[PDB]
């Protein structure tokens, strides 16, 4: 997977919280060690308009 996370929501990988769209499914429940490799999307993930 690869989804454009919000700024701090790279830290919302922590149980119990409401996400922006992780409302549907995401939010670590018991023992999801889902590997993630993250960084600043600020290369191109910001557009005129």
């Amino acid at each position: 997977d690869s989804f454009v996370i919000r700024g701090d929501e790279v830290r919302q990988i922590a149980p119990g919280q409401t996400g922006k769209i992780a409302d549907y499914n995401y939010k670590l429940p018991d023992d999801f060690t889902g590997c993630v490799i993250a960084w600043n999307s600020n290369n191109l993930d910001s557009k005129v308009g």
Partner: protein, 38 residues
């Protein structure tokens, strides 16, 4: 007036969107999210 709190704060969010902060709008909307959720 917790719902009027939501009222004032999302009016703040709409005006932030119109001003062109983008930045402020996005993560102050994160603030409002963790406000109305909690």
């Amino acid at each position: 007036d917790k719902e009027w709190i939501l009222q004032k704060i999302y009016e703040i969010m709409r005006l932030l969107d119109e001003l062109x902060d983008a930045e402020a709008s996005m993560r102050v909307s994160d603030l409002i999210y963790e406000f109305m959720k909690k």
